Enzyme design. Structure first.
Site, PDB file in Angstrom:
ATOM      1  N   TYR A 173     -14.437  -7.110  12.520  1.00  0.00           N
ATOM      2  CA  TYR A 173     -14.589  -6.638  10.916  1.00  0.00           C
ATOM      3  C   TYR A 173     -15.301  -7.355  10.151  1.00  0.00           C
ATOM      4  O   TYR A 173     -14.934  -7.950   9.168  1.00  0.00           O
ATOM      5  CB  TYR A 173     -13.028  -6.592  10.700  1.00  0.00           C
ATOM      6  CG  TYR A 173     -11.972  -5.677  11.283  1.00  0.00           C
ATOM      7  CD1 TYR A 173     -12.404  -4.271  11.149  1.00  0.00           C
ATOM      8  CD2 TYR A 173     -11.099  -5.846  11.991  1.00  0.00           C
ATOM      9  CE1 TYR A 173     -11.519  -3.470  11.676  1.00  0.00           C
ATOM     10  CE2 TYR A 173     -10.145  -5.174  12.429  1.00  0.00           C
ATOM     11  CZ  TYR A 173     -10.558  -3.597  12.524  1.00  0.00           C
ATOM     12  OH  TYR A 173      -9.689  -2.714  13.061  1.00  0.00           O
ATOM     13  N   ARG A 174     -16.786  -7.364  10.467  1.00  0.00           N
ATOM     14  CA  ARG A 174     -17.647  -8.205   9.894  1.00  0.00           C
ATOM     15  C   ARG A 174     -17.796  -7.672   8.247  1.00  0.00           C
ATOM     16  O   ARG A 174     -18.445  -8.327   7.478  1.00  0.00           O
ATOM     17  CB  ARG A 174     -18.765  -8.417  10.365  1.00  0.00           C
ATOM     18  CG  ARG A 174     -18.780  -9.243  11.586  1.00  0.00           C
ATOM     19  CD  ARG A 174     -20.081  -9.009  12.575  1.00  0.00           C
ATOM     20  NE  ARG A 174     -21.512  -8.674  11.757  1.00  0.00           N
ATOM     21  CZ  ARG A 174     -22.409  -9.340  11.865  1.00  0.00           C
ATOM     22  NH1 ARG A 174     -22.473 -10.676  12.329  1.00  0.00           N
ATOM     23  NH2 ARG A 174     -23.515  -8.931  11.006  1.00  0.00           N
ATOM     24  N   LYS A 193     -14.862 -11.364  14.003  1.00  0.00           N
ATOM     25  CA  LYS A 193     -15.920 -10.552  14.727  1.00  0.00           C
ATOM     26  C   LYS A 193     -15.959  -9.181  14.725  1.00  0.00           C
ATOM     27  O   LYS A 193     -17.067  -8.529  14.777  1.00  0.00           O
ATOM     28  CB  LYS A 193     -16.070 -11.288  16.056  1.00  0.00           C
ATOM     29  CG  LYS A 193     -16.806 -12.796  15.679  1.00  0.00           C
ATOM     30  CD  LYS A 193     -16.527 -13.414  17.044  1.00  0.00           C
ATOM     31  CE  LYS A 193     -16.965 -15.009  16.832  1.00  0.00           C
ATOM     32  NZ  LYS A 193     -17.087 -15.710  18.281  1.00  0.00           N
ATOM     33  N   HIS A 207       1.049  -1.355  -0.004  1.00  0.00           N
ATOM     34  CA  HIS A 207       0.015  -0.018  -0.139  1.00  0.00           C
ATOM     35  C   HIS A 207       0.894   1.527   0.174  1.00  0.00           C
ATOM     36  O   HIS A 207       0.432   2.369  -0.464  1.00  0.00           O
ATOM     37  CB  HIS A 207      -1.075   0.071   0.988  1.00  0.00           C
ATOM     38  CG  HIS A 207      -1.965   1.067   1.471  1.00  0.00           C
ATOM     39  ND1 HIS A 207      -2.515   1.293   2.364  1.00  0.00           N
ATOM     40  CD2 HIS A 207      -2.536   1.763   0.225  1.00  0.00           C
ATOM     41  CE1 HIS A 207      -3.543   2.266   2.299  1.00  0.00           C
ATOM     42  NE2 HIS A 207      -3.335   2.571   0.956  1.00  0.00           N
ATOM     43  N   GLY A 209       3.776  -0.311   7.010  1.00  0.00           N
ATOM     44  CA  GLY A 209       4.942  -1.162   6.305  1.00  0.00           C
ATOM     45  C   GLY A 209       6.043  -1.404   7.286  1.00  0.00           C
ATOM     46  O   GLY A 209       6.755  -2.257   7.076  1.00  0.00           O
TER      47      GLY A 209
HETATM   48  C1  LIG Z   1       3.406  15.094   6.864  1.00  0.00           C
HETATM   49  O1  LIG Z   1       2.666  13.848   6.836  1.00  0.00           O
HETATM   50  C2  LIG Z   1       3.840  13.055   6.386  1.00  0.00           C
HETATM   51  O2  LIG Z   1       4.825  13.718   5.965  1.00  0.00           O
HETATM   52  N1  LIG Z   1       3.670  11.832   6.509  1.00  0.00           N
HETATM   53  C3  LIG Z   1       2.394  10.950   6.678  1.00  0.00           C
HETATM   54  C4  LIG Z   1       2.913   9.596   6.086  1.00  0.00           C
HETATM   55  C5  LIG Z   1       1.897   8.927   6.255  1.00  0.00           C
HETATM   56  C6  LIG Z   1       0.842   9.334   6.262  1.00  0.00           C
HETATM   57  C7  LIG Z   1      -0.331   8.173   6.001  1.00  0.00           C
HETATM   58  C8  LIG Z   1      -1.664   7.720   6.375  1.00  0.00           C
HETATM   59  N2  LIG Z   1      -2.173   6.778   6.087  1.00  0.00           N
HETATM   60  N3  LIG Z   1      -1.144   5.974   5.960  1.00  0.00           N
HETATM   61  C9  LIG Z   1      -0.863   4.562   5.937  1.00  0.00           C
HETATM   62  C10 LIG Z   1      -1.631   4.138   4.420  1.00  0.00           C
HETATM   63  C11 LIG Z   1      -0.940   4.909   3.463  1.00  0.00           C
HETATM   64  C12 LIG Z   1      -0.419   4.263   2.377  1.00  0.00           C
HETATM   65  C13 LIG Z   1       0.659   4.943   3.295  1.00  0.00           C
HETATM   66  C14 LIG Z   1      -1.661   3.920   6.931  1.00  0.00           C
HETATM   67  C15 LIG Z   1      -2.768   3.386   7.002  1.00  0.00           C
HETATM   68  C16 LIG Z   1      -3.347   2.791   8.106  1.00  0.00           C
HETATM   69  C17 LIG Z   1      -2.668   2.531   9.020  1.00  0.00           C
HETATM   70  C18 LIG Z   1      -3.130   1.732  10.332  1.00  0.00           C
HETATM   71  C19 LIG Z   1      -4.293   2.229  11.226  1.00  0.00           C
HETATM   72  N4  LIG Z   1      -4.977   3.212  10.700  1.00  0.00           N
HETATM   73  C20 LIG Z   1      -6.467   3.605  10.897  1.00  0.00           C
HETATM   74  N5  LIG Z   1      -6.620   4.754  10.219  1.00  0.00           N
HETATM   75  N6  LIG Z   1      -5.175   5.426  10.440  1.00  0.00           N
HETATM   76  N7  LIG Z   1      -4.354   4.525  10.655  1.00  0.00           N
HETATM   77  C21 LIG Z   1      -4.660   1.386  12.005  1.00  0.00           C
HETATM   78  C22 LIG Z   1      -4.169   0.016  12.588  1.00  0.00           C
HETATM   79  C23 LIG Z   1      -3.075  -0.287  11.819  1.00  0.00           C
HETATM   80 CL1  LIG Z   1      -2.284  -1.844  12.065  1.00  0.00          CL
HETATM   81  C24 LIG Z   1      -2.842   0.558  10.713  1.00  0.00           C
HETATM   82  F1  LIG Z   1      -1.646  -0.166   9.823  1.00  0.00           F
HETATM   83  C25 LIG Z   1      -1.310   3.219   9.260  1.00  0.00           C
HETATM   84  N8  LIG Z   1      -1.100   3.862   8.378  1.00  0.00           N
HETATM   85  O3  LIG Z   1       0.252   4.186   8.252  1.00  0.00           O
HETATM   86  C26 LIG Z   1      -0.072   6.753   6.094  1.00  0.00           C
HETATM   87  C27 LIG Z   1       0.380  10.267   6.877  1.00  0.00           C
HETATM   88  C28 LIG Z   1       1.427  11.395   6.767  1.00  0.00           C
END
Ligand SMILES: COC(=O)Nc1ccc(-c2cnn([C@H](CC3CC3)c3ccc(-c4c(-n5cnnn5)ccc(Cl)c4F)c[n+]3[O-])c2)cc1
Length: 236
Positions: A162-163, A160, A44, A189
């Site tokens: 994340y249905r 359960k 992603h 990542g």
């Molecule tokens: C100034 O901003 C900068 O310079 N940097 C900056 C760099 C990256 C981002 C940004 C936004 N989203 N994401 C990623 C997906 C994007 C493709 C990269 C993402 C998606 C989901 C999750 C996540 C969650 N979450 C649910 N809701 N949020 N988190 C919950 C549990 C678990 Cl287990 C998770 F993995 C984590 N991440 O990271 C990265 C923003 C700003």
């Protein structure tokens, strides 16, 4: 990382910060060193990435503020995204970065082992998620690498919660019933690292979740053990 605490230098030497340089330089994702030329991360992460030309891999970083115009980094020779990846929530969220040169392992940059052959039925009780991501849903990237201990949950309980999604055996979930500790934006990542018999193993890749650290909503990780064959085939 929500509910986490600051890491110290050398604590998670397999953690890298993946930067993009377009249109400006900034942390994009976490990743893990798994070989001298190989980073494992989430597919992603490359949604918006026109090519490997704009990536930089930094290792041995504690604070993002350490990175200056003279800080050395590894160029990315290849991005290898799993050929079935479509979106994070439907799985296969896994990518290899082949670096342009080999990492020389030091106290500050070291590989983490894959889950070991024959450990398919281990119960990991010491797992940690790390990264420079948000401390809450609407926050900012953190200067200092954060760490949080999070327990694994069974796929049955995860389904359960994340249905609306298909939680598969190629996913692994981790989180507290009452929330409070989880990955968040900017952590994906990076590793879910579990220590077993005093050896760290890359058990998960931080991938997605509904909110950050919400009650009854575990974080969802790529289940690395189910991709060992794919990794070995790509890296060999
Ligand atoms: C100034 O901003 C900068 O310079 N940097 C900056 C760099 C990256 C981002 C940004 C936004 N989203 N994401 C990623 C997906 C994007 C493709 C990269 C993402 C998606 C989901 C999750 C996540 C969650 N979450 C649910 N809701 N949020 N988190 C919950 C549990 C678990 Cl287990 C998770 F993995 C984590 N991440 O990271 C990265 C923003 C700003």
């Amino acid at each position: 990382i929500v509910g986490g605490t600051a890491s110290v230098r050398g604590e998670w030497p397999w953690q890298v910060t993946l930067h993009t340089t377009s249109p400006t330089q900034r942390h994009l994702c976490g990743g893990s060193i798994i070989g001298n030329q190989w980073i494992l991360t989430a597919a992603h992460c490359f949604y918006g990435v026109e090519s490997p030309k704009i990536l930089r891999v930094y290792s041995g970083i504690l604070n993002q503020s350490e990175i200056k115009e003279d800080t050395s980094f590894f160029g990315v020779q290849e991005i290898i995204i799993h050929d079935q990846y479509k979106m994070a929530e439907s799985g296969y969220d896994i990518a290899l970065l082949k670096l342009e040169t080999t990492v020389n392992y030091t106290d500050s940059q070291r590989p983490i082992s894959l889950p070991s052959k024959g450990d398919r039925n281990v119960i990991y009780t010491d797992c940690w998620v790390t990264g420079w991501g948000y401390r809450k849903l609407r926050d900012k990237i953190q200067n200092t690498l954060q760490k949080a201990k999070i327990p694994l949950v069974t796929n049955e309980e995860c389904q359960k919660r994340y249905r609306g999604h298909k939680i598969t055996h190629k996913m692994i979930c981790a989180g507290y019933r009452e929330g409070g500790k989880d990955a968040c934006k900017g952590d994906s990542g990076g590793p879910l690292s579990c220590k077993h018999n005093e050896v760290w193993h890359l058990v998960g890749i931080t991938s997605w979740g509904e909110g950050c650290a919400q009650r009854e909503r575990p974080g969802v990780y790529t289940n690395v053990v189910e991709y060992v064959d794919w990794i070995l085939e790509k890296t060999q």
